[PDB]
Design a protein around this ligand. Structure first.
Ligand SMILES: CCCCCCCCCCCCCC(=O)SCCNC(=O)CCNC(=O)[C@@H](O)C(C)(C)COP(=O)(O)OP(=O)(O)OC[C@H]1O[C@@H](n2cnc3c(N)ncnc32)[C@H](O)[C@@H]1OP(=O)(O)O
Ligand SMILES: Cc1nn(C)c(C)c1NS(=O)(=O)c1c(Cl)cc(-c2ccnc(N3CCNCC3)c2)cc1Cl
Length: 382
């Protein structure tokens, strides 16, 4: 195969085994000062997401044009407040919220974003960025706009002295460092079958299916409660120690832990286990991301929870995740999603998760290293 754009980039070749660890090319000593040229009629615009009007414009772009399933039945519906959470973590930069507008109408038609992240990859910690929310309006697809967005964000990141990035995609590109699979745990099977997210199993009736997926009304783990301000330091401690066992992980400051885990209704939930001694020994977390159900007369949205980071030191992981499912059901979610990364394969089948269609590929930009199994991936992106 051939990749017109990706073959020009500092990434390894598909199907070539890597034995070394390091950058594909050295750091650049001079960087292009001018933005890359867009097709006539379009212009760059940095989006100030602290402006209500601009945030809503981005919401609308993504709501109408972002990731869909293969059958064009579901589309991610990131809320404006979720977008602020995902795009303004500690160290965020305005120039890294990179929009494309039509010059005449001002209509937002493209976006790409970078946020800073310290990333541990095997035996090296690098300052990187995480690239997310790459989106081109449906009416502009297949016109090679994506490569311009990627090159422009690369340039803007280079200006800040950063030369590596991490990103995920549902498509195969040169060259995945890890390959994960989505799994889904039905919470509201009647709705999920009705909207054709799932189907009735061959030998199962609806009644049997509702029975199969039924959950306790309240969590069972002793001392489980929502994370509070006082828990920030211990959650940071727990996470840092837990992540050591994997080969691709974030390295979060205490300020970053506060940002990513402190509960915000309809965005991020974190529950800690505070034991009989008053010690926090475990935590679970999941984020809120609904999908629009396209072309349906009565069901308009699928409420999905996504497993984030789950740390166990005294509570079995199986128990923690059982409680995450119950909590998600209580909060009105239709489905609970998780990847087969970290120690997740240890609970997925047992807790009645079903395997999904889509893969999620993990990539590094300008870093060559051996690929890893899903269980060694310890990084979750929004
Ligand atoms: C040091 C700092 C570095 C910073 C940069 C790090 C790298 C960041 C990399 C980006 C990480 C993004 C992380 C996320 O946000 S992944 C989420 C991507 N977004 C969506 O799926 C939303 C709905 N889809 C769209 O908007 C798409 O049609 C997009 C915008 C993706 C492509 O628009 P379009 O359909 O109109 O195509 P084109 O004619 O303009 O361009 C075709 C070229 O684009 C390559 N392509 C297609 N999809 C992806 C993809 N998901 N990652 C990387 N490359 C992709 C494709 O192979 C081809 O290259 P090649 O085969 O000829 O070589
Ligand atoms: C319910 C639903 N709604 N939507 C929109 C879909 C596709 C489903 N079905 S799904 O659960 O089984 C699922 C899900 Cl959630 C997500 C992806 C996927 C694909 C490509 N890219 C990403 N990224 C997300 C993280 N950052 C950028 C890359 C995700 C694929 C599948 Cl197939």
């Amino acid at each position: 195969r051939s990749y017109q754009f990706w073959d020009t980039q500092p990434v390894p070749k598909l199907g070539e085994v890597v034995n070394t660890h390091g950058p594909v090319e050295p750091d650049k000593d001079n960087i292009r000062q001018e933005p890359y040229t867009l097709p006539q009629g379009f212009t760059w615009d940095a989006l100030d997401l602290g402006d209500r009007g601009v945030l809503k414009e981005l919401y609308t772009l993504l709501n109408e044009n972002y990731v869909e399933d293969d059958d064009n039945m579901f589309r991610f519906d990131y809320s404006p407040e979720f977008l602020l959470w995902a795009l303004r973590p500690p160290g965020w930069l305005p120039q890294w919220h990179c929009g494309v507008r039509v010059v005449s109408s001002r209509k937002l038609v493209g976006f790409i974003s970078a946020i800073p992240a310290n990333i541990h990859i095997y035996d090296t910690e690098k300052k990187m960025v995480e690239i997310n929310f790459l989106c081109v309006h449906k009416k502009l697809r297949s016109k090679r706009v994506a490569p311009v967005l990627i090159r422009e964000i690369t340039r803007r990141v280079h200006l800040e002295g950063i030369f590596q990035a991490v990103y995920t995609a549902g498509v195969v590109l040169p060259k995945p460092v890890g390959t994960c699979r989505y799994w889904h745990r039905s919470l509201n099977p009647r709705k999920l079958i009705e909207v054709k997210f799932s189907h009735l199993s061959r030998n199962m009736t609806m009644q049997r299916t509702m029975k199969l997926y039924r959950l306790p009304e309240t969590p069972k783990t002793a001392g489980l409660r929502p994370m509070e301000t006082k828990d920030i330091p211990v959650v940071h401690q727990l996470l840092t120690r837990y992540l050591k066992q994997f080969h691709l992980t974030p390295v979060m400051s205490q300020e970053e832990v506060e940002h990513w885990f402190y509960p915000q209704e309809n965005i991020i939930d974190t529950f800690v286990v505070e034991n009989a001694n008053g010690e926090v020994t475990d935590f679970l977390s999941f984020y809120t991301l609904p999908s629009t159900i396209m072309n349906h007369p009565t069901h308009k949205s699928l409420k999905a929870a996504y497993s984030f980071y789950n740390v166990h030191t005294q509570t079995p992981l199986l128990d923690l995740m059982s409680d995450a499912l119950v909590l998600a059901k209580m909060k009105g979610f239709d489905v609970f999603n998780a990847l087969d990364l970290m120690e997740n394969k240890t609970f997925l089948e047992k807790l009645k998760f079903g395997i999904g269609d889509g893969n999620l590929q993990y990539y590094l930009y300008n870093w060559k290293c051996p690929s890893m199994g899903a269980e060694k991936v310890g990084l979750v992106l929004q």
